[PDB]
Write a protein that binds this ligand. Structure first.
Ligand SMILES: O=C(O)CCCC[C@@H]1SC[C@@H]2NC(=O)N[C@@H]21
Ligand SMILES: O=C(O)CCCC[C@@H]1SC[C@@H]2NC(=O)N[C@@H]21
Ligand SMILES: O=C(O)CCCC[C@@H]1SC[C@@H]2NC(=O)N[C@@H]21
Ligand SMILES: O=C(O)CCCC[C@@H]1SC[C@@H]2NC(=O)N[C@@H]21
Lengths: 120, 120, 120, 120
């Protein structure tokens, strides 16, 4: 797959893929912004047989509660791994907070992250 | 957490949460629409300590390649589990295909899924 | 086109289409939630020749500053008008606030609105 | 406001703002990709009183039917205008096609566009 190890997005966040096999992967995520500190568990999936000439579809989930802090939010990234230098993971993400039924309408943020091997 | 077992969204898709503990959960996803057949691996996260009076933020990833088929796409759902009948998981999802660099602009679909215990 | 007049979404918000012709339409939007009060200008577009058997693609923009208040946010809805009772406009929307460069990552909310002729 | 004139996004698309006043603006949009050719009408809104130190929230709609072609789709951009060189409009967009009720789930694409004064 080629995603093993450390990645950095344009915010200085740190994604560490510690294991990847059979279309699934695991690791840690450390966000440089927002209500977060130290590392959070990360689990995701990837296309283990990408079509020739295309990127490798990926996706992963991060619940932003560790033993130090809980923002009560879950983020998910969806995009594709693009090989050949510059290698990059281009994503769009959803950040959803647990809310009351009256506040569901404002429960989800949307953004996009670009991950690279070298910290920007 | 309360998400164990079978869920159905408004499309007739089937989400089976087979294990859930310590802020992470696993299972299968079977999509009633699109380029899919049989079951696909599912992995995700959830807020294991939701604030009082709010929903439980969730999120999960499904790579749509099993041993029968590969759509070369990865989907991620992000939202919250709402307890108290009617119990429901309200989500918004991203479906991203592996593409060529010329086609990245049209690589991601966006939608929203509402999951319930009873099939609609 | 068939969108002239008053619409209500699932939040009790009020959309009034005052004119619609030649693929463009105008009106007012009154949001029942968030930092808003009274009416805001609304401008949008629609497919003036929808394919047979399909819905009519629509889209409109609302800057949430009137002469009474300014939330410093702009919302856009994108979806389709579906004819035949029950007539409905199904949408997904983006709400973007003006921010500092350090806060761009959390500048946009995402949701979905379903509009109907009768207030829910 | 400062958005008058020609803009280019990272795809080579051309956005021409022909008039802008009182929180609303108009113009043309020419997309370098997808089912499009020549120019399409564009209408949108902007925050006419942005908070000090922040960007100017914007948003606009483009129905992709001109007198030459109809893709049966409507796109909307939502984001903010950032002043001070490099001036830029950062956006996230929704592209929604008119569909049958069975195909609504796959009716909307999601992406992000960055517009600049100089064509990339
Ligand atoms: O504030 C929170 O609720 C927890 C931190 C959220 C950080 C978000 S998650 C998506 C985006 N990309 C990042 O690397 N960080 C932000
Ligand atoms: O067509 C594909 O690429 C694979 C099937 C995708 C099914 C999507 S995933 C999100 C949405 N919700 C569902 O239950 N099914 C569709
Ligand atoms: O709080 C603000 O920034 C202004 C009010 C925003 C209301 C949003 S716009 C999209 C969603 N749908 C509605 O009818 N209201 C909310
Ligand atoms: O293919 C279509 O349905 C019409 C052309 C769509 C072009 C899209 S709209 C959003 C994105 N940004 C662009 O400048 N072009 C694409």
């Amino acid at each position: 797959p080629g995603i093993l190890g450390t990645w950095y997005n344009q915010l200085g966040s740190v994604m560490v893929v510690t294991r990847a096999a059979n279309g699934g992967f695991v690791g840690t995520y450390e966000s440089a912004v927002g209500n977060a500190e130290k590392r959070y568990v990360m689990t995701g999936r990837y296309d283990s047989a990408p079509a020739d000439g295309t990127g490798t579809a990926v996706g992963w989930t991060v619940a932003y509660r560790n033993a130090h802090r809980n923002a009560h939010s879950v983020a998910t990234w969806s995009g594709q791994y693009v090989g050949g230098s510059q290698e990059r993971i281009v994503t769009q993400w959803l950040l959803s907070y647990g809310t009351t039924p009256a506040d569901q309408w404002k429960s989800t943020f949307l953004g996009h992250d670009e991950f690279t091997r070298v910290k920007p």
